[PDB]
């Protein structure tokens, strides 16, 4: 039941590889969904195109920002803003696909796969579904990144769409 999404990822516009992520659309099927249609494109909008904006290397890969391109952008299928769904999940390591925002109750379509246990950011970011293939292509991600985030290539999001 529970949707597969890939990203196809690109390093300076050369392909890299697939990622897969389950949805957990059993426990937050709003944000899920929001991820979902984001992914297909099927509004007319989401994430195709769109780059990885921050790469904290042992820490996260930050995204989802497919209108300004550096954090400052993004929307939901709901709204500019939708609220926080619940925290019934946790980061409880690598690989774990949450909510970024900017307070409680501003989920857009920013988002972060964990490189590493965040456990400082349950209970403040909505966990929605977990990488199930290519951790390794996030790993390979991950040394683009920088202790700042700043990255040294651009990471972008060249096809993305729903298994
Ligand atoms: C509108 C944006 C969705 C929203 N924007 C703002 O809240 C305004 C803040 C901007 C900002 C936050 C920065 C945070 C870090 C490093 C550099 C930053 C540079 N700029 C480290 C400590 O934390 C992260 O990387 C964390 C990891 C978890 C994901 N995550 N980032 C967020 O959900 C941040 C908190 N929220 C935004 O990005």
Redesign the pocket.
């Known amino acids: 039941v529970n949707p597969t999404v890939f990203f196809d990822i690109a390093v300076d516009g050369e392909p890299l590889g697939r990622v897969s992520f389950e949805l957990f659309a059993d426990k937050v099927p709003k944000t899920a969904e929001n991820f979902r249609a984001l992914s297909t494109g099927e509004k007319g909008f989401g994430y195709k195109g769109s780059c990885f904006h921050?790469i904290?290397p042992g820490?996260?890969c930050?995204g989802?920002?497919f209108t300004r391109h550096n954090?400052?952008?993004?929307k939901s299928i709901y709204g500019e803003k939708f609220e926080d769904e619940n925290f019934i999940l946790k980061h409880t390591g690598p690989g774990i696909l949450?909510?970024?925002?900017?307070?409680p109750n501003?989920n857009?379509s920013?988002?972060?796969i964990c490189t590493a246990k965040?456990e400082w950011?349950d209970g403040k970011?909505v966990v929605f579904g977990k990488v199930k293939e290519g951790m390794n292509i996030v790993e390979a991600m991950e040394r683009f990144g920088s202790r700042?985030?700043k990255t040294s290539k651009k990471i972008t999001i060249a096809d993305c769409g729903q298994l």
Do not use: E, P
């Not at 949450?98 to 307070?103: E, I, K």
């Open positions: 921050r904290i820490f996260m930050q989802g920002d954090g400052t952008g993004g949450s909510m970024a925002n900017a307070g501003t857009g920013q988002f972060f965040t950011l970011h700042n985030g």
